[PDB]
RNA sequence: UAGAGGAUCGAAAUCGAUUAGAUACCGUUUUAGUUCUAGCAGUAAACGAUGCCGACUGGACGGGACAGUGUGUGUUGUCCAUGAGAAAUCUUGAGUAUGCGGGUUCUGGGGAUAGUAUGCUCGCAAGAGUGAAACUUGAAGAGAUUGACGGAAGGACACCACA
């Protein structure tokens, strides 16, 4: 029933883009939440983190409104967060899930020591900030768990991590700032140059120029 | 409110004071509102009757210049200066001494 | 060691702006021993210094590979058993980075000091 | 903060600590001076009178108390 | 230096570039410039811009256009009225997609606007005039080519062809010159085969 | 996990970099024609947005495509 | 108070774009057409769609009124404006080059007839 | 505090108005003081409410001094980015990563009691400097958002407004 609307959406319908790691590599904006259901099919879980009420005064009545914060990720390397405020609570949760899907990102995973095994923890230390809220992640040895707060825990499990330490600072009872400071702490560990990214690779064309002929006809 | 803090004074401690022309209160000279005007000595609705009265064959009516000086309360009340919006507060107007006539 | 800390802040500034070279208007003897330990580990391309009978001059050639460098003041005294606690405080992971000490055998990083049974005064780090 | 400056740091940090109220009662030894029962956790008393006290608003009530010795 | 422009020869185009005042810049110049520049005279305090500069960059701009197989996805943009005629002529001679008039905010990002677009390369006749089109390219991964004059900003621009923007003649001169390279470098065409059709480009 | 590396700053490019762009040029046959090949360049959003991403691009083209 | 609403203006532009070559410049003709094309009920509405059209027609057809793009009319107005004038800018030969423009010529060695001022 | 001086203005005092009442705003009569010399005192929204010294860092339009000749050094005003910040805002810093260490000081640790008692040092005094507790109490505070109100300012209007 999904009649796609953009170029990247059309290719995913024709099975020219088979994974999600083909879009992340060239930084192509995802505009439709159906491109994520069909490339990570039925391994996408959800978690409602928070819901509260907002109020405004005008010349025609006080408007009450509901805000929701939601996170999604499969269990492997992807995770995203979104948020919306609408009249009733069911349409706010459902609209904030379409925004979380369109903000999926990848996460780099690594080992605590050595170079052998399958990755279980974060690749180095990192921190994130959002309005005086500060989160620190530290890589943990195998068979440790995820030691952190409750709402932090649901973000680090949907990303595919198994071992981690955290320390937090600042005003963390603003639960939407606490959730954004900890998504930025994973984007920081994944943004450091490691000594195996030192040697270059050959260049290639993004998928909008490889499949140029298929677009017209 | 303002980056001036309300007055045109930089890199000096004190700056001299004056007495307002309407109420007579003491104010810094850099903070007062100052206006300059050149008025004809004779009113404009009286020039015709003055051209038949003159005894000289060529007459020029005189003009004088006047500088005025008021305080913030006296200029705001008299509508010499008005309340402006946040962005329009930053617009300064000058004189350009290099104008040709 | 006031010249060692001035040099590390000017390097962090250029490595963030994307510069290729850096010219500083000073140069000391142990500032050049610290730089020679980044060259043999692959983190800079090279350098060169001038003699002018003033405080000296030095020109560093950057690479694209440095994440950060620092200096520690004051220069604490660490026994060979306390080498490993300073490593968990200063480097992000267990596989890369180098902490440098001034021992009775020269300037060594934290892997060599353990294979020679010595301690000394801490100077800085880089990863 | 030089390497030979530890006497300047003990002198400085002891004086800042006195600005904590809980620490100041212990350090100056005046934590039990103005206290109606001193160091006991419970105490005995004989009952003189039997009074009633108003609640503090916004609560309407009368709480029953006693005057003792 | 002078090796990218020496692979072709400005065959007689020195006339068409000097006749229409395509080298007369402006009074002001930034430290961004002074590398495309030749000099400024004392008579009118006008800045003169090198002709190899305008020829070195037109060689690169033509090679980026040809890199796209289907040229029906290279939008050209011009808001002002002097460019209404030149731009529409430089789309049948090549095969691009023209966008003239005022630029509607939301053309590339909003999918509920009058007409929707999605080019792979963008060409602009003026940076300060087509301000919105440059700014909107930074939301959809789009390269841009410009015609920076002397005082414009170079932000969000990759290839800058230093030329003249004000005069109606110089605007049509630039689009004529670049038009023949794209035919020359694709098919077996001639560079100087006529100098009378530059009257069809002028406003 | 992989990230491209910028062609002008040697910085790896993130996936949420929506101002980063890719440029392909035609491999110019001698005698002024196109033969059928291209050369790719990658740029990141930071260099492109500060406005200096133009003085650095032609400098690099002089080393790989018109060097000597 | 003789302003025409949006539903009566917005409709006359749809008519002037599809059935444009069926309309000419008199009220009694354009009213006959809007009875053929449109389907409204109020006889006051056709009277105003027809009266706004006859003003659009002698604007579009004589001078300047953009904001509507008539496909069939973008040929007559274009084939008469592309008349090549009697002189091109490749005719003058006494090109009065300047001085600093001149010394930029010989250092690259350009060809032509450049007369300094 | 001592001497000299005395135009103008003016606490305190005093009448006349205004007012329900005004020991006030406004006015009349009239002083200490306001000035100079020699000293005491030691406080201010003494404010950019913004320690001192050292290293490094994009643009645009200016000013003031010196020296050169198409520029430089020391200072300084306005406006834009990058970066920073809770935000307002900051641009030789309020920038240089919680990626946290250049040298060396001072001050703060919920509100109120209270800069109050007491001791001590200084002063002719008026006072200044240093400086608590018992008892009480759940907030006091910063910046910004939408409303409501102003014995607030504008621009439009109307024979339930004027002409
Ligand atoms: Zn006054």
From Swiss-Prot, chain B:
GO terms for biological process: translation. It holds the Pfam family Ribosomal_S26e. It is found in: Cytoplasm. Keywords: Cytoplasm, Ribonucleoprotein, Ribosomal protein. One of its GO terms (cellular component) is cytosolic small ribosomal subunit. Gene3D superfamilies: Ribosomal protein S26e. Disulfide bonds: none annotated. GO terms for molecular function: mRNA binding; structural constituent of ribosome. Component of the small ribosomal subunit. Belongs to the eukaryotic ribosomal protein eS26 family. This is Small ribosomal subunit protein eS26. It comes from Encephalitozoon cuniculi (strain GB-M1) (Microsporidian parasite). The lineage of its organism: Eukaryota, Fungi, Fungi incertae sedis, Microsporidia, Unikaryonidae.
Swiss-Prot record, chain D:
The modification Hydroxyproline is found at residue 58. Belongs to the universal ribosomal protein uS12 family. This is Small ribosomal subunit protein uS12. It comes from Encephalitozoon cuniculi (strain GB-M1) (Microsporidian parasite).
From Swiss-Prot, chain E:
It is found in: Cytoplasm. One of its GO terms (biological process) is translation. GO terms for molecular function: structural constituent of ribosome. It comes from the Eukaryota. One of its GO terms (cellular component) is cytosolic small ribosomal subunit. Keywords: Cytoplasm, Ribonucleoprotein, Ribosomal protein. Component of the small ribosomal subunit. Mature ribosomes consist of a small (40S) and a large (60S) subunit. The 40S subunit contains about 33 different proteins and 1 molecule of RNA (18S). The 60S subunit contains about 49 different proteins and 3 molecules of RNA (25S, 5.8S and 5S). Interacts with RPS21. Belongs to the universal ribosomal protein uS2 family. Required for the assembly and/or stability of the 40S ribosomal subunit. Required for the processing of the 20S rRNA-precursor to mature 18S rRNA in a late step of the maturation of 40S ribosomal subunits. This is Small ribosomal subunit protein uS2. The gene is RPS0.
UniProtKB/Swiss-Prot annotation, chain G:
SUPFAM superfamilies: Rps17e-like. Its main location: cytoplasm. GO terms for biological process: translation. It is found in: Cytoplasm. GO terms for cellular component: cytoplasm; ribonucleoprotein complex; ribosome. Belongs to the eukaryotic ribosomal protein eS17 family. This is Small ribosomal subunit protein eS17. It comes from Encephalitozoon cuniculi (strain GB-M1). The gene is RPS17.
